[model samples]
Target: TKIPRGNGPYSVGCTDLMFDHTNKGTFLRLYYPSQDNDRLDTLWIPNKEYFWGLSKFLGTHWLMGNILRLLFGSMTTPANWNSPLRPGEKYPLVVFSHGLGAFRTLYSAIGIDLASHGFIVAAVEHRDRSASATYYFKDQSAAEIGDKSWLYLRTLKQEEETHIRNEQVRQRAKECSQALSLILDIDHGKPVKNALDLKFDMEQLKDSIDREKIAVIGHSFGGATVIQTLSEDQRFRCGIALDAWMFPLGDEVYSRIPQPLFFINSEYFQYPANIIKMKKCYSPDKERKMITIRGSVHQNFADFTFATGKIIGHMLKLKGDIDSNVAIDLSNKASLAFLQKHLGLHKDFDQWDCLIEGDDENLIPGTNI
Candidate 1:
């Protein structure tokens, strides 16, 4: 099955780059507008181990992993693979985070849309064992020959949940910060080598970034990453959290974030407990907004919503009562409006400003819970 094409004018391009190259290195998937009229399709998921990791995350066994691979291993998302970077423009940057059991590539829907709308999106692959699966080189030798060492999600025990979750969240925050720094350095013409050694030149990115218009975005556990990242790094001007799983955060972070934050929630994923934690972030001094998609589930914020048939997608909670494309369109449009406002962009995205207030018939102003 094909993932949906971006809903904006610019043609999107995608690639992978790993900085530092070792097990502790930073890895990310980039989605940006490309200058080349010629294009190539991007693999939806390139690695075999990620499917196995997903099976484990699904509370299933090895057999399901094979089945998932058979079903989706060759799927492609609509993007110009390894296309040349679009030059002569300083695109705003968005540093993205993925939910639990998810890696960099799973959020292509959001990334591609943002890129199509004239933004450069970096979807970070977390190394804190929150991702379903991720890999890095053992050292220089391994990297030269592409020998990758894989890491998988950590299944925490009930007794250790609070502490481990807190630890992981902090590590994710660090990774986000590091990713922002890496990109910014490249924007200023850092000569860093891309460990993956793809054809897309790092030099083309020099002075191609809108230095001050950076934002952080994420889904589920990644929502917490946005909050943690904003609280710790003043470099991020704002953040948008999609169906945020707020339980992993420490109490101290709630009142500390100074940047603008928008919460775009799914109708079915939240509960009173989670909503209460989201409420804790409220204060007169901070700029915060929230809206819920009327018929969405948690997975609507991820690309898996478009990767399968309706029946199976619904069975996996990847599809919701509202159409998947419709829900994502609402989410993506609203996010665009929020970004335009908070990042001080001159784009006409303000047309959808009503979405930020949950003004659409398919949206709830705050949340159901």
Candidate 2:
């Protein structure tokens, strides 16, 4: 989990761009190592169409989808593109799963910062549930962002039918893993078109990749997706769950996840109810870690909290100095350390263990499940 080199207020040489996989296009935002001579690799995504198709599946009303279309229609996430790759190096791969209603670009700060540090990061846009539309296979599509699927609000409605919801969650887990395999396979020289051209070479990565050192990390529902994915795929060596919602994971998934797992919780989020469920899922013998970010809210883990001023930040339940980037940097740094340690990448992030322990007076270590 090497951080990118160069300093200029922001992480150096990151690009914000998109990849169109033809008619069934996927709108992907990438963050990778940059240099003077590096060529950008193209990432082909077949699921882009599926993301879009999800909107229709979620049944957004006529006016709502159109409004979503207007806001997210042509926006490209920010990142460093065309900058030279760290020469002769193919870094480990990290696949990111976002929370409910969040689009791929929502976590650009984390993705780009990680890419700058030398990892190839791909944040997938889950169809129908994200903040925008993503199309896949034929014309199947989904939308969210603004469509208001009503699913989020319905979780409590069908709370007692937990098993049924878990089933749908398991399916989502499989889909996410499949998406990772598709993108990685293409990066390994498989023929894929409709990928965005970032001016970097994808072919050079074949021999350079440390294939076994891969990890999956996510937030909220995406966090549960990480657990489900690890349970079904051995390719993922480790997983990090950020304030994960354990409801979607059935009892079977809890005991079956064999890899190292970590959880980062927010101060206001870990209610005894959810904490009980989280505790039930932990394996005593496995490498498990937990931390809490004090003075933070669920939205603090995302950029939306920062988009607003301090007044609105707190109104939305976000914590810390809204004008300060401290919280974001802390969260990202901790994440980098965890992935680095588990992925076996040599880096200077070990000192942050205290942060994870929630020992910092300013930052609360989360309750251990």
Candidate 3:
């Protein structure tokens, strides 16, 4: 299926980068506005499925091997592999992590929309546990997308090992951060092998980087990553958690985060318990923002819900009282407003603050937490 493009003014371009790190090789997709003066703000993602896949593969598991190959077969994410350096301006960066059994390409709607609106968006593909695997037999390779297996339930079960799972999640977060650093540091003479067979003018971005502003955003377990990342790194100036799961965070992280945070919740999924934890995450000293999209579900913020028709979409918990396009427009517009206000960017997003203040009837805003 073709990924939907942003309904915003700017044109978006994407590219994938390969990182050779300890344990395995990982890939990250970068999205940005197709502009002459576009800069780099790197994003990191440690996919939820990749972690589970790694855990399963390391154990005695022939079943997982076959499953991995079947799911990721021949599918590829598109991005400029040899783009010209388009630097000199510093752009606000956003790192997006995915939910259990999801991959980098799955959230193209968010990534592409952010890129079109003058932000650098990176969606990382963690090895192994992703929804699919990029398998290589000799030189021939293919992607295999996973089926409706019990992958999510299994990951939840694995998460029961709190300490070990947290460690794994944290390591993934660090890896994503490191990838962001490397992309920002790419030099003129640097010779990095292009993983995906794509090409662009790299010289355009040679001097377009805005290093002062950065944020992390994610869904499900990824939302938890956003919280954990912001707590650990002051370098990340802000964060936006869309239906954030509070399961992975340690006791001290809620109080330790120094940056601004925003939470966008789904009406049906925002239970009292999660809401309680969401409120506890905020401190009197930190700036906090919360809003609930009317009729939206947990999947409304991602691309999966939109891929199907209105009937099917609603049935899958992807649509609400609002149309899918209307829901996503509201979500992205609200997100842009939060990022612009906190990241100190000049834009027309400030007007959206009214929505955050409980003004819009169609898109209700509140802090029941």
Candidate 4:
């Protein structure tokens, strides 16, 4: 199944940007409002190696990669490819992090929707080995020369799980901060080079960002990254965690978050232990909100929910009992309302303010578990 188009008013455009061109450099997929109405949509999965990485992550043999390719290699996300950014208006920004085993391109659903609503969404690719696969140029010369060196996820031993995940979370937070700095500099008209040749201009971004309205969002491990990032950087005004997996975080982080936080969760993915950690984040003075999407699995918050039909998706635990489109629309709308409230925007998204309170029929006010 193809991914759905965003349900917002403005048209969406997408492109890739990589600054500094090394393993530690910033790489992200950007979704923003576009001036053009017609352009080829972006390819959903641009590389075969990502499918192989997914297969390996699933504990399947190499053969599964071929099958996955035959199934999804040609699918495209609904956005204009490398189109010019919409001018005459400054947009807010969202720094996005992906779940474990995911890379930058996987979260176009959320990014496109936010962009359609006039927010610039940057989905950063992590180099912490939490991703199934990601790449970097060995040096500036290799970047210009088009030589990419790929890095795959590490299979950690049982004893290494605790420290490794913790370390990766810290790295993910640093990556998020680095990405924010890169974009903020560009917003101030700092000249920078994009490693890939996508026929789009970066200068259009200068003075196009609403500097004070930045936020961070993620799913699963990314959820934890949001917490860590908000704690470390005051530049991020707020955070939203979608089906956040709290396992990667340390106890010290609970007392550190001061910005507003929202936790939109799937019904089946959270348990007492994970929810306990989320509960520890609450304090009398901080603004905190949560909602659970009824009849949803963890994958409901991911693009995989749209990758297959009911039978296979159900067998694979990709699709949930709640329709994929329905579930995502709720989450996106709720996120919009939250962003509007926290960022002090004058937008009409406050119509969905009730969603943040879990007032919908398909949602539980706080959580099921």
**Candidate 1, position 120, lDDT:** 96
**Cα-lDDT of candidate 4:** 0.92
Model 1: per-residue Cα lDDT over 180-258, one tens digit each: 9999999898899899978888888899899989999999999999999999998999999998899899999997899
Scored against the true structure, residue 154 in model 2 reaches a CA lDDT of 26
1-369 per-residue lDDT for model 3 (tens digits): 234566666656676665442234556677877644333422222233443453363453646644534443333333232334344456677888876556676687788788777788877654434334332212213222212122322333654567745765675577567656755665233445444444654334444556777888888777877888787777778988888877666777777788898888877777776787788887777888888887778887776575557776677465676766676777788888888888898878887777655567766666544
How far residue 268's Cα lies from its native spot in candidate 2, in Å, is: 1.2
Instruction: Single out the weakest 10-residue window by summed lDDT for candidate 1.
Output: 1-10
All candidates' lDDT scores?
Answer: 0.92, 0.60, 0.64, 0.92
Measured against the true structure, the TM-scores of the candidates, in listed sequence, are 0.99, 0.75, 0.78, 0.99
Q: Please list the Cα RMSD from the true structure of every candidate, rounded to 1 decimal place.
A: 0.9, 6.7, 6.8, 0.8
lDDT by residue for model 2 (85-151), tens: 4557657777778776666656665676666666777676654233344433332132212122222
Name the weakest run of 10 consecutive residues (lDDT summed) in model 4. Answer: 51-60
Which is the leading candidate under lDDT?
4
Clashing pairs counted in every model: 0, 47, 43, 0
Estimate the lDDT of model 2. Answer: 0.60
- lDDT of model number 1: 0.92
